[PDB]
Paper text:
Prion strains propagate as distinct infectious scrapie [name] (PrPSc) conformers that can take the form of amyloid fibrils. Here we provide a high (3.0 Å) resolution cryo-electron microscopy-based structure of infectious brain-derived fibrils of the mouse anchorless [name] scrapie strain which, like the recently determined hamster 263K strain, has a parallel in-register β-sheet-based core. Unlike 263K and wildtype [name] prions, the anchorless [name] prions lack glycophosphatidylinositol anchors and are severely deficient in N-linked glycans. Nonetheless, the similarity of our anchorless [name] structure to one reported for wildtype [name] prion fibrils in an accompanying paper indicates that these post-translational modifications do not substantially alter the amyloid core conformation.
Here we report that with methodological improvements we have now obtained cryo-EM data for [name] fibrils with sufficient resolution (3.0 Å) to determine a detailed structure of the amyloid core. Analyses of 12 tomograms indicated that all [name] fibrils sufficiently isolated for tomographic analysis (n = 64) were left-handed. The resolved [name] structure comprises residues 93–230. As with 263K, the [name] monomers span the entire fibril cross-section and are stacked parallel and in-register perpendicular to the fibril axis with an average spacing of 4.9 Å. Residues 95–104 near the N-terminus of the [name] core sequence are held tightly against residues 140–144 by an interdigitation of alternate sidechains across the interface. As in 263K, in [name] a β-arch of residues ~103–140 extends from the N-terminal steric zipper residues and has an anvil-like head that we previously, and unaptly, described as a “Greek key”. The C-terminal flank of the N β-arch provides a flank of an overlapping β-arch of residues ~124–167 to form a middle β-arch. A staggered interface between the head of the N β-arch and the C-terminal half of the core has the sidechains of residues 120–124 of a given monomer interacting with sidechains of residues 169–176 of the both the same monomer and the one below it. The β-arch defined by the disulfide bond between C178 and C213 is stabilized by a tight interface. In [name], the residues 220–230 project away from the disulfide arch and interface with residues 165–170.
Numbering used by the authors:
A (entry chain C), B (entry chain A), C (entry chain 1), D (entry chain B), E (entry chain D): 93 to 230
Amino acid sequence: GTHNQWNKPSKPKTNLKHVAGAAAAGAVVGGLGGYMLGSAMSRPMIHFGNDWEDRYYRENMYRYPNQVYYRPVDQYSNQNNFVHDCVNITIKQHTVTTTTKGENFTETDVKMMERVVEQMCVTQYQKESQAYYDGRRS
Amino acid sequence: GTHNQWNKPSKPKTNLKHVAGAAAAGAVVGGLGGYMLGSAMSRPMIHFGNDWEDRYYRENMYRYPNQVYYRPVDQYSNQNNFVHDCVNITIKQHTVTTTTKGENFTETDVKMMERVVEQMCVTQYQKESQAYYDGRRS
Amino acid sequence: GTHNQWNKPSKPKTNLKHVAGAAAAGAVVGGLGGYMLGSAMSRPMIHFGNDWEDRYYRENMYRYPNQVYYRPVDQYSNQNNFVHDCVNITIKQHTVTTTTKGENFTETDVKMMERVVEQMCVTQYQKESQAYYDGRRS
Amino acid sequence: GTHNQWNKPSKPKTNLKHVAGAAAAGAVVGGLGGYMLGSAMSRPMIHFGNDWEDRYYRENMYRYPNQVYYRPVDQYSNQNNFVHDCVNITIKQHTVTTTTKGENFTETDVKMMERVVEQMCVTQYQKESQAYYDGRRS
Amino acid sequence: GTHNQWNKPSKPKTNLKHVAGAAAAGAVVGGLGGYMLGSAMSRPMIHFGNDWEDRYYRENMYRYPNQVYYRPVDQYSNQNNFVHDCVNITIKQHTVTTTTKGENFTETDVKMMERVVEQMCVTQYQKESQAYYDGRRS
């Protein structure tokens, strides 16, 4: 048989920025086995040219067995937490004066602050706290 | 047989920005096995050219067995929490004066603050707290 | 047989921004096995060219068995919580004066604050709290 | 046989922004196994070109068995909660003066605040609280 | 048989910026086995030229068995936390004067601050806290 193939693409612009199987960009993972993933496959396909295939054996007998288990026998956790952001906290004493004229002016200003804030974005503290765990085996 | 293939694409612009199997971008995962995923497959396909296939054997016998179990035997958790944002907190004492004329002016201002805030965005604290856990086995 | 294929696409603009199997972008996962997913497959298909197939064997014998179990034997949880946002909290003392004329003016202002707020966005605290858990086995 | 295929698309603009199997974007998942999903498949198809198929065997014997179980044997939960937003809380003392003329003016203002707010967006706290759980086995 | 192949692409611009199997860029991983991943494969394919294949044996007998287990026997955790950001905290005493004219002006300003903030972005501290764990075996 006679087979003829012709292809003259003009200015082929192909763009592929981010390709991943298990992409974790700018991510924060917690403690005590926070993230558990078995498998992740990503295979994009782009075809532009001529494809000629015949009487082939492409793919057979594919298996994807995955087991993700979370079995702690004796797990003890007293305090568990996480905080992402504590942003834009300010204590300000602002005064603006734009006097343009006057006579015998007496501008007296008094500004006082006493014990404004005691706690701010405070996490996971114990004061005079007692924890008892008597794990005995025989 | 005679087979002829012709393709002349003009300015083919293809764009593929984000492709992933299990994408976790800018994500926060909690504790104690928060996220559990078995499998994740993503395969987009784009075809533009000529495709000629015949009497083939593409794919057979595909299995996707997944088991995700969460079986803690003895799990003890006293305090568990998480806070995402604590934003835009301010305590302000603002004064603006724009006097343009006057005579014998006596502008007296008094501003006082006493114990404004005691707690702010405070999480997961114990004061004089007792926890008892007597785990004994025989 | 004679087979002829012709395709001349003009300015093919294809856009694919976000494709994923199990996409978790900007997501927060809770504790104690919050998120449980077996499998997730996504395969979009786009065809533009000529397709010629004959007497093939594409796909057979596909199985997708998934088991997601949540079986904690002895789970103890005293306090469990999570807060997303605590935004736009302010305590302000604002004064604006725009006097343009006067005579023997006596502007006296008094502003006082005493114990404004005690608690603000406070979560998961125990004071003088006793927890008893006597787990004994024989 | 004779087979002829012709296709000349003009400016094909195809847009695909968000495609996922199990999409969880900007979602918060609760504790104690909040989210449980077996499987999720999404495969959109778009066809524009010529398709010629004959006497094929596309797909057979498809099974999708899914089991999602929630069987905690001994689950103990004292306090469980979650709060999404606590937004736009303000305590303000605002005064505006726009006097344009006067004579022997005596503007005296007094503003006092005493114990305005004790609790604000406070969640899941125990004071002098006793919890008893005597789990004994033989 | 006679086989003829012709391809004259004009200005082929191909771009591939980020391709990875398990991409973790700018990510922070937590303690106690935070991130657990079995496998991740990503193989994008781009075709532009002429492809001629016949009576081949491409791929068979593929298996992807993955097991991810989290089985701590005796796990003890007292305090577990992590904080991402503590940004834009300021305490300011700002005064602006733009007087343009006056006569016998007496501008007296008093600004005082006493014990403004005690705690700020303070995490995971114990004061006078006692922890008891009697793990004995026989």
